[PDB]
Every structure is written in C-alpha cells, then in structure tokens.
Amino acid sequence: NYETAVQFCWNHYKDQMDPIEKDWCDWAMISRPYSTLRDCLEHFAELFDLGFPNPLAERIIFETHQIHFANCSLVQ
8 A cells, every 4th residue: 555655654754854843944954854755755656566756755745845845945
C-alpha cells in the first residue's frame, strides 16, 4: 500500500519539521529533511512499481510548500 508508506514518510518529515518551525525559511537547513522526504516518497514508489513523480507524492510536495515554505523570504 503506497498510501500507507506515504503517510509514514510524511509523518517522519512532520516530526523533523515541527521542532524547528522558527527555521522553516532556513533554506539550506530545511533542505535536509525535505530531501529525505523526497527520497522516501521515491523509495516506496519504486518498491510498489509506481512511477515517480506520481500524483500522491506531488500532493505531499504541494502540502509542505503550502504549510511550511509559502510565506518564507527568499533570502536572509
């Protein structure tokens, strides 16, 4: 079940992002837990023989941009 694996990826990501809400706009810093999220989404996509990117994975990507990065400054 890819949907279940995705929730696993998303919940691990949320666990990393929650304690550092003050630094969601620290681009170089948040790129690490974000990269793991992407690696996780791709890993299970491959495991379940689905393509990557796929719509569910892309909804997750849109979700973090909506809740974490949408109002961040691009610099400094």
